[PDB]
Design a protein around this ligand. Structure first.
Ligand code: AGS
Ligand code: AGS
Ligand code: AGS
Ligand code: K
Ligand code: K
Ligand code: K
Ligand code: MG
Ligand code: MG
Ligand code: MG
Lengths: 525, 525, 525
């Protein structure tokens, strides 16, 4: 279709405008004094929220070029979301600040490539220095503290997460499920988790977590690619009965078959989700088997001349619950018998003995750990379905934050970590003056989060920014009480990982937009 | 429908505007400091690319005449791409440069035909001069160097390519496949490659390479054209079982049959790809047999009263893997037994003895080389599926570039080769003044690539151009470091083949546009 | 009337647009290869000029804000013109260069006050550096050389000027008049020149020189202010007869009387011009008397109870010719008798003896020097009225240039002086980054003159600028022959005074525009 094509500054003003509409809508919701954003709905009362992600997903602009700018930033923020699980508003505010001054520098005649290089050098040095501000979170006491703080001061949620990590290790798998009613429950079941997400959205039955969740489903373990639905027809119907959902763990589910699954499960016609088998090559088959041994299923490989048509509900594996993200599948409590499972473990355990290569050794140890590690499960307390569903949400978030904190620690919140780091980089220089402008653009943007938080309070950004910059260490501004103090002692913490991610993703998009010379989009016809 | 018709100048300004929009969008991506171009998508985030071809594909204009000019010059990139697989952006800026000055000369009253003749003469001599400057890439050391340079300084990839060419010769067939995991693998198998691509896209299952790849497929060797699907029905079903893809190597697959194959394999209903048989006439049949002997199949020719209906999976040939490009089919590791194959070789070997004509002699030697040469297979190292898939890409590109280098050598990159050539042609003249202007148009356009590379750096084109022209030999401008020096010593080389192709296709399309007097298109209604 | 009021950016873009129209129209006329500009006339053929001042005078824009910007920068040329009588085009291109980059920096957010401070510092140091590079023009050989060069290599005009200055001193008064025919004439007459211009234009009968010229006029020396025309009526009529013009040298001619004089002399009704009396206070009267003694007139002061009504043509002084500029009156050849004049000299000469103060002593020596110095008169050769009128023009210009050269020396022309100065200031810095940007804005603007000269040649500005900057000293580009060489040896020189003035006035007006925040003008109604 005929295209509209814009160059240089023409494209620049358009991108900046789109970015500003997105960032301005989103940023009003940052921090304890975040304001409400009303999102219209075709049916019912409008949604009223302080959650930046919800606001962002609704942002689409009429002007084609402006919409492109908006969509570009949305992407990165969501990426920060995927990587750290928090800080999308922070990232969006950092991105607007870098893009705004960067595009201005470009209109001023500065070399885009150099501006980008300066920005990148500042970020690289900045994340390194952010580590110096970090407070580790290794012992259970620390884990408990972070969890409590992340759970709105609920020392209960804190103890739960700490105990859970104490069971399966802070690097282990942990899940949360509705409780049986009153009093929490923590138990380790036979489970496993591999790096493979849904073969397409839609399967996502819980957009709240943007994941797919199945209860007591059957697990088809096909050691091959599935293109023709015909092969599935027999098994899909066998599963149609028994009224249980089906999880497809094949080498891959291609267009034809996948398309059908997406349409059928879209019409309530049998609930089925598909994900690729873990690993590739040889180890793939070996791993697909570990899953079988765990779920009590039977691998259907063509190597042994087996057909999916000739597959009954007896071949299928089974587990009490399975959850799959954008890129992760977790099987909770499989039917497999400890006899077969523990035996399988013994086998692989000898494999490691006969290992003649570190690589093969590592890969084997990975399997035993997965098959012998299990899955810690947290069943949230209760006393009414409403409160139970609520506390469950808190435990979910607290857990998420604590996990990030365990990986890279926590730093002062309220935007002080980033501003503290920027205030110590004023002497940083690059190869030339344009690169030096880039560095300054970056150091300046690092103050935007704190500034927006204060602005949302109804206070003066520059005055508070100044005062914070004047102190040192964790000295900062508490936006909830409007008093200065030690951010760590006041319990205003951000996982180091989310702060670093927000900055790197913001810088990354900004760098791309700053070095964009031409935009192509459909004509507004 | 009713047409809009434009003549001379009216048509010229339209064409020029159309080529300018396309060329301007494309040329910003040229070189190490190429800028980003954002391409809108109907869903999700826009595409951000520094790839010229990707930009060109999206260019379509509203004004019917301007669109014609854009689509015409777009042919330059596509042909240069098909012929050399690189240098499409370079070819596009050369075309714009030639078209711009050429149309100006026409508007000035100069004879279009003479202008074109002059341009052609300059290009003819320029190509000869380009060959003269070309540095060979014959020994394994040179091959290793080029490979390393093309692999982003990865001396590993360099060694691999060098060893692969040492096995099957620099003219031999070489492929790259995913590795078994960690450490590369190089092995020669029974294989062959002939000049015939897919009989239509869609068969392309891997758009990343725009090629078709089949694993352990059956190979139908039919010595005749296939129009009716009926004939295939019996064999297609036999192949439906055993769950293996099918490669059709017939004299040709016409509409009816082809259309069906495209639709069926489009629905996952049996994976089948079709390509014409190598050569034509008599040699065609002899060659179709060489493939049979290699894949252990049986030629199904009507000459012996054979029917496709009466063809079983036993007649079909087979190989571990086959890959087909837009114009190349490569069969890797065929089932044929060394007894039959090596025997077939002996036969053709005598054919050469009894050869009473050089032509027949050449053609025969070509067959023995293909059948006795084999196929070197490069299995890329690993250590995680992600890195493995990445390194595979690099090896593929490095191989492609090194192959080109071996054919015609290499010349200084950064646009300096064309500048040196242009300076050597300063005294070139034609039959008249208009032809002389055409020659000058071409020599001037030869500086465009270096000038655009510099412009993208944010430096001054005329100053750098002036300085490079000031020195000589491999003296050029390194746009990555913004330092002058010896292009070869700095490792900035271009295969002579891509430079030559870019120039010839640019001059070719430019010549046509310059000699265009009238344009016809549908009325904007 | 109602006003239109604009602020910041809105006002800025308007001013920039206005200076760009003016500067672009003017700068095309710069240097040896300056282009022609056609200026429409209400009647007859249009004016075709390469004179920057002629072009600037015609520039007026429709948009009220754009017009203001144009008229403001137009002040640059006029002031530089009044100060050095040359380099108005150079001054305009320097102003546009400073304004353009300065307004960009303002739009980029830099502090306007600091940008101006940085620009001002750079110009201050640049002027000092300019004086350091200046070569003196003190001896008659140098004076002859400069004159020759300024007269288009006419060694004749060079000798004439050298001799004239040798007569009355290089600081003495010199005039040029039509010759009697063939062969030049140099003689000194009883004359004097004081710092007082016409009390209003209109009196200007020769717009070519923008000055007023009277031949054999009567000189009224009234020692008081004249407000009522009544007083003049009697004398004006006495002068109405004898058919001679009248020069009014009173303490001042105020509104009423002045207005009448402007109207009457506007209708050919008696030619009269008025100028204030030299000096002020006491010395004023004494000086007004020196003029009387020189012109043979009689001071009409009220102190002795004298009335202008009772003044006859006998009281009026007289001289063969008088010329008055915007701020200078020169009486050439007065009627006064050498007896009275030389006697008056003796008087003042004793005054100097009895002087008890240096100040009084200096002031007295100034008077004797004026009254005893006379006025050198150069009568241009001939051989046909046409050639005579021409040579006269050259002598006038060569004289003007040589005068400037004597005052401050000469520097390489072709814009190389400013380029050499700029390079010597590469390390100049201010109090902060914004001031440093200002400094760079100024150093960059200094290359504008040379670049525009090259541009008008049809050559590449950056290439030539680069080459010139590459060399040093008087190495420069000769735009007439398009060859590099020693500007001095090639005779391409500019009086340090015009280069200095162009730079200071440009920076002065640029600094004012850069620090303007609001513009007020009438509503376009
Ligand atoms: N009392 C407080 N004073 C100052 N800042 C606080 C306080 N409590 C929390 N914060 C900060 O507020 C920020 C988090 O606010 P949110 O509104 O959740 O936005 P976000 O995490 O950047 O993006 P979302 O949540 O993905 S939308 C972090 O910088 C917190 O440290
Ligand atoms: N450091 C360098 N300095 C100068 N030129 C370089 C450098 N590195 C690569 N080049 C040149 O850049 C050109 C290739 O740039 P590309 O952006 O890949 O465009 P292209 O190959 O013309 O078209 P594509 O790649 O098909 S879009 C060749 O002239 C290279 O020699
Ligand atoms: N052969 C030459 N090569 C280079 N520059 C020259 C040459 N001859 C004169 N110039 C320069 O041209 C400039 C003077 O050009 P003009 O066009 O007269 O403009 P201007 O004096 O700046 O303004 P006007 O004359 O008042 S409009 C000075 O910088 C001279 O040194
Ligand atoms: K919020
Ligand atoms: K590129
Ligand atoms: K001029
Ligand atoms: Mg948050
Ligand atoms: Mg390329
Ligand atoms: Mg001049």
């Amino acid at each position: 279709a005929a295209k509209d094509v814009k160059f240089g500054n023409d494209a620049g003003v358009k991108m900046l405008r789109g970015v500003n509409v997105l960032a301005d809508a989103v940023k009003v919701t940052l921090g304890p004094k975040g304001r409400n954003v009303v999102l219209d709905k075709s049916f019912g009362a409008p949604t009223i929220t302080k959650d930046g992600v919800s606001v962002a997903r609704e942002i689409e602009l009429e002007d084609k070029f402006e919409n492109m700018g908006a969509q570009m930033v949305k992407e990165v923020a969501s990426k920060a979301n995927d990587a750290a699980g928090d800080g999308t508003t922070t990232a969006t505010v950092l991105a607007q600040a870098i893009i705004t001054e960067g595009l201005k520098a470009v209109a001023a005649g500065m070399n885009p490539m150099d501006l980008k290089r300066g920005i990148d050098k500042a970020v690289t040095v900045a994340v390194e220095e952010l580590k110096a501000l970090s407070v580790p979170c290794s012992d259970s006491k620390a884990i408990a503290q972070v969890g409590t703080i992340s759970a709105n001061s609920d020392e209960t949620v804190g103890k739960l997460i700490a105990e859970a990590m104490d069971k399966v290790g802070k690097e282990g798998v942990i899940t949360v499920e509705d409780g049986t009613g009153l009093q929490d429950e923590l138990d380790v079941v036979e489970g496993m988790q591999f790096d493979r997400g849904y073969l397409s959205p839609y399967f996502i039955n819980k957009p709240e977590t943007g994941a797919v969740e199945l209860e007591s489903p059957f697990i088809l373990l096909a050691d091959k690619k599935i293109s023709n639905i015909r092969e599935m027809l027999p098994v899909l119907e066998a599963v149609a009965k028994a009224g249980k959902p089906l999880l497809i763990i094949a080498e891959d589910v291609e267009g034809e078959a996948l398309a059908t699954l997406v349409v059928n499960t879209m019409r309530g016609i049998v609930k089925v989700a598909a994900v690729k088998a873990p690993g590739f090559g040889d180890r793939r088959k070996a791993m697909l088997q570990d899953i079988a041994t765990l779920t009590g299923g039977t691998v259907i490989s063509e190597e042994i001349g087996m057909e999916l048509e000739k597959a009954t509900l007896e071949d299928l594996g089974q587990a009490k619950r399975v959850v799959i993200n954008k890129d992760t599948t977790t099987i909770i409590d499989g039917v497999g018998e400890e006899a077969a499972i523990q035996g399988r473990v013994a086998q692989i355990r000898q494999q490691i003995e006969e290992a003649t290569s570190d690589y093969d050794r590592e890969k084997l140890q990975e399997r035993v750990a997965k098959l012998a590690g299990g899955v810690a499960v947290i069943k949230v307390g209760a006393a009414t379905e409403v409160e139970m569903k609520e506390k469950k949400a808190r435990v979910e978030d607290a857990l998420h934050a604590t996990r990030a904190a365990v990986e890279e620690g926590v730093v002062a919140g309220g935007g002080v970590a980033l501003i503290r780091v920027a205030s110590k980089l004023a002497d940083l220089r690059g190869q030339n003056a344009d690169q030096n402008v880039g560095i300054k653009v970056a150091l300046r943007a690092m103050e935007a989060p704190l500034r927006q938080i204060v602005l949302n309070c109804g206070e003066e950004p520059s005055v508070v920014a100044n005062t914070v910059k004047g102190g040192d260490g964790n000295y900062g501004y508490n936006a909830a009480t409007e008093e200065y103090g030690n951010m760590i002692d006041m319990g205003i913490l951000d996982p180091t990982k989310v702060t670093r991610s927000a900055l790197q993703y913001a810088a990354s998009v900004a760098g791309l937009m700053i070095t964009t010379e031409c935009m192509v989009t459909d004509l507004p016809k």
